[PDB]
Design a protein around this ligand. Structure first.
Ligand code: ZN
Length: 187
């Protein structure tokens, strides 16, 4: 999917990680793909060249990468939906959760029924040029009844207070047992 830096030069950044066998989450620049273990926090950096207007929001939504599956709402498999691992904020069917943020909004589009999680957009801390949001994936890419080995992307959208698009970026994601090994193979 096309990126849209927009008027605020919005784009994503990822901490440099290796491919050690025990790594828990690692990003591949050449594949623009995140490899992470089930439910493991993934810090994602939000970079801007200019400060978005007050009240802006940041939405994270998952979609299937392949054209033939793109219309299907990405959700957790029946097993995980029922495993009772909710934090009391995220609906049990949501694949993507946010952690370390007091204001997450778990939404479901009235028309597409697609799930997404929004947090307020906040400027970078003191002595920092980016803002970090921590995401976690509650299902494995291999989950039958769920993603069922189908690769997905995590569309991150900067929107204004009215929900208008300000910027957009994305990255592919693979939730697996050994991110380090899988990253190496796919590369
Ligand atoms: Zn699952």
């Amino acid at each position: 999917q096309k990126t849209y830096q927009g008027n605020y030069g919005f784009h994503l950044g990822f901490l440099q990680s290796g491919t050690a066998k025990s790594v828990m989450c690692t990003y591949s620049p050449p594949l623009n793909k995140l490899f992470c273990q089930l439910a493991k926090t993934c810090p994602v950096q939000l970079w801007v060249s200019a400060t978005p207007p007050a009240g802006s929001r940041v939405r994270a939504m998952a979609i299937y990468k392949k054209s033939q599956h793109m219309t299907e709402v990405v959700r957790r498999c029946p097993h995980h939906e029922r495993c009772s691992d909710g934090d009391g904020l995220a609906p049990p069917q949501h694949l993507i959760r946010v952690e370390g943020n007091l204001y997450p909004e778990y939404l479901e589009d009235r028309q597409t029924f697609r799930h997404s999680v929004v947090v307020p957009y906040e400027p970078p801390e003191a002595g920092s040029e980016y803002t970090t949001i921590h995401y976690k994936y509650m299902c494995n890419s291999s989950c039958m009844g769920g993603m069922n080995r189908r690769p997905i992307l995590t569309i991150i959208t900067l929107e204004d207070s009215s929900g208008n698009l300000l910027g957009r970026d994305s990255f592919e994601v693979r939730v697996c047992a050994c991110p380090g090994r899988d990253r190496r193979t796919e590369e």
